[PDB]
Amino acid sequence: DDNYLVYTNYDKQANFKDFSTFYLADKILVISDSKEPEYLEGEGAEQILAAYTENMEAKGYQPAADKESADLGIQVSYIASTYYFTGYTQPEWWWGYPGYWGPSYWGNWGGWYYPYAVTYSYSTNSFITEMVNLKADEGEGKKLPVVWTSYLTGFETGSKAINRTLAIEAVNQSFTQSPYLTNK
Ligand SMILES: [Cl-]
Ligand SMILES: [Cl-]
């Protein structure tokens, strides 16, 4: 079947009916071989972010006015280089990129909390997406928990595949294989 691979992992204790609204970070972080965070520009990135938006709405979640009022946050990253991951050891290897999303982008949290295992092999031309619980306690030393992660990878590079919107099809697939991710 598909010209890509989609892996999803999630918090089995999370109650996806707890949440009503989400805020999607409105730019896709490029993980590059330099420390300064840069983002994808242009139509493609806009279409990928629109696919997250549409999918969350289909599952019952409304876009929030802002981060402070949202129940759930989503952050999306494109891996263009694995320079920072060589010799990784942490299962969440993306944390090794100096420019990676910080908890403090979202609110008063000082680190991440992963309530489930991830076993993804790093590769470029791939996406890491994390969904965070913004209702979690804030304050000094408090950690921002993730409720869902996806890894979109293994994308074919021949012209027929490039000319299909494969990233969007992979985003759609990540929701299809996450039947629990709904408040309905
Ligand atoms: Cl697990
Ligand atoms: Cl709080």
Phi, psi of 162 (to 5 degrees): -60, -40
At 155, list the tokens: 């994308």
Q: For residue 139, how far is its CA from the centre of ligand 2 (angstroms)?
A: 7
Please report, for the chain, the start and end positions of each structural domain, with discontinuous segments joined by +.
1-183
Q: For residue 118, how far is its CA from the centre of ligand 1 (angstroms)?
A: 7
Cα-only R_g, the chain: 16
Residue with the two structure tokens 């802002």:
66
Q: For residue 13, how far is its CA from the centre of ligand 1 (angstroms)?
A: 11
DSSP symbols for the chain: --SSEEEEEE-TT--TTS--EEEE-SSPEEE-SSSS-EE--SHHHHHHHHHHHHHHHHTT-EEPSSTTT-SEEEEEEEES--TTTTT--SSSGGGGSTTS--HHHHSS--EEE--S---PPP-SSEEEEEEEETTSPPSTT-EEEEEEEEEEE----SHHHHTTTHHHHHHHHHHHT-TT----
- 6 exposed, middle or buried (CB, 10 Å; 0-12, 13-18, 19+)? buried
Q: Which experimental approach was used here?
A: X-ray
Q: For residue 108, how far is its CA from the centre of ligand 2 (angstroms)?
A: 8
Answer whether CATH 3.30.160.670 is correct for domain 1-183.
yes
Rounded Cα gap, residues 141 and 122, in angstroms = 29
Closest Cα partner for 52 from 139, 148, 144?
A: 148
Phi, psi of 8 (to 5 degrees): -135, 145
Q: For residue 138, how far is its CA from the centre of ligand 2 (angstroms)?
A: 4
